[PDB]
Design a protein around this ligand. Structure first.
Ligand SMILES: N[C@@H](Cc1ccc(O)c(OCc2ccccc2[N+](=O)[O-])c1)C(=O)O
Ligand SMILES: [Ca+2]
Ligand SMILES: [Cl-]
Lengths: 306, 301
């Protein structure tokens, strides 16, 4: 359970913890995650790669899908441009400390046997359910394309084709994963990570919303981005600064300050920080300052490698 | 970070800025005094862990084994106390501490040492000496000799850092007043005994010894003071705070929410204060974690 603790920690749900126990009893086990290549890799990506590294340390072989064909179907551009971004993304994930098997979706998702099962699955997936599964994933389209409903079926089939025991993704993948659990002969365990709040507090962090910290942002950019961030005094949920403190910072954490309010604060844990903030013993401005400097240092090794 | 490793789980540092200055030097030392004890318990272990923190931050560690004080306080003959102290040395080594050891009797009766005690006695008012002892103490002459003896011992050691309990606070402040070299003082908390009636001591069933068997640990924790919802003065919660590693998992039935993974002591504290974690499940968890923490020590002894 030191391993299992490593896995469950900071996830939103595991479907199911029962089945996940049975998986852990094996000398060979594999876990996969896919990412549409993105020109900006931000903290939401980093959270998920941290979880893949967790799974690695519990004895899992890790597969990262650079999902060039998914990004193509989801209107991100032409394959050759997308693949270039994918190669950059691979370098960022490696810089994050993940040594894994990096594979382009198009290396397997065009195989005759893959496609034939996409077509089998299409006969069993309603249009309603396919479109519903994409509400949090599909690029906004006034006039939605056929591509949008092929995408979730292709994703269902990826775990079947590769024979992985565990699929990891953000909570926005939840509906595809439930479809996958109903349709495939072997259940695969699904681990869902939280979705970070955008820096302005409006909805989720996204490469296309301009409301994110990128792992390669400069110190000066990170300070500017945190200083303008939404950070309501004493409110924790939907507060992206507190989310950063929860999911990325290392404790103990020293928050310097003059003796005239409370003096220097050595914070033992995120929970201590949460108490201090909810009781308004720590002001948003001082929280932001400390979080900016700590995140700059956490991200420095990734920056240095790119 | 080195400062944070030294501060964690201390009661006070006199002073933090001075500590940060010491941390810049490439050669630095810290001392602590222990009266030799036939059983080494978690109260001792708390203080040795703090010397290990210092050792890991580059300090050379000196342990003063206080055999003269023990001899004067009626704990036996000096040769008998030496045998206990030599055992304590093996326990501290098993705990991970690499230190130099000195017995009080090896320096504190030397002629030039004694003359300096008397020099300090001539300089030091009874009023100031009594004030330094107000907390530790028909008062005896011994009461005012103790503080000037402690000051002289700090002068004789010449360490950068002194470590002890808040009980020693006023002695440490007198050392800082009277001596040219300003020693940095680190004060550690004390542990409640398993009975909840005072500080951990060698009273029957009132301590966990670091070499207690797993069954002895389970039996003592089972009958310890641990009232529902109470964190203050709760020795089981203090053990979770000062010795356990986080995160940790508490098995709990699904109708309560299922197994608990607690990220930190503070998360444990809120849960227990709220009666969201029952004393018997806290006790069972703390006992099993503590057994695992102590096992490498037990096996080296
Ligand atoms: N939906 C994910 C992307 C993702 C997740 C899991 C996968 O197995 C995955 O790749 C397979 C795939 C799924 C859907 C369409 C195309 C492909 N493809 O690249 O061949 C992509 C995202 O939102 O970035
Ligand atoms: Ca025994
Ligand atoms: Cl002594």
């Amino acid at each position: 359970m030191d391993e299992f603790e490593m896995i469950k920690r900071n996830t939103s749900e595991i479907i199911s913890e029962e089945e996940l126990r049975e998986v852990l009893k094996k000398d060979e086990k594999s876990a996969a995650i896919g990412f549409e290549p993105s020109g900006k890799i931000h903290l939401g990506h980093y959270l998920q790669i941290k979880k893949m590294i967790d799974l690695q340390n519990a004895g899992f072989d890790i597969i990262i899908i650079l999902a060039d064909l998914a990004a193509y179907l989801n209107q991100k551009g032409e394959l050759d441009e997308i693949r270039k971004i994918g190669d950059y993304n691979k370098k960022v994930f490696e810089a994050m400390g993940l040594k894994a098997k990096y594979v382009y979706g198009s290396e397997f998702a065009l195989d005759k046997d893959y496609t034939l099962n996409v077509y089998r699955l299409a006969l069993k997936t309603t249009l309603k359910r396919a479109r519903r599964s994409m509400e949090l994933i599909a690029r906004e389209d006034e006039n939605p394309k056929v591509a949008e409903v092929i995408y979730p079926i292709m994703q269902v089939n990826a775990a079947h084709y590769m024979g992985v025991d565990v699929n990891v993704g953000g909570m926005e993948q939840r509906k595809i994963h439930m479809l996958q659990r109903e349709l495939l002969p072997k259940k695969v365990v699904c681990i869902h990570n939280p979705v970070l709040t955008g820096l302005d507090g409006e909805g989720k962090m996204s490469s296309s919303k301009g409301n994110f910290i990128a792992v390669d942002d400069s110190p000066e950019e990170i300070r500017a981005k945190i200083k303008k961030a939404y950070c309501p005094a004493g409110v924790v949920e939907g507060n992206p600064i507190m989310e950063i403190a929860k999911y990325f910072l290392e404790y103990p954490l020293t928050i310097k300050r003059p003796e005239k309010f409370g003096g220097d604060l050595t914070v033992n844990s995120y929970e201590e920080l949460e108490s201090l903030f909810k009781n308004k013993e720590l002001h948003p401005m001082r929280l932001k300052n400390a979080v900016a400097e700590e995140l700059i240092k956490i991200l420095e090794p990734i920056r240095k490698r790119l």
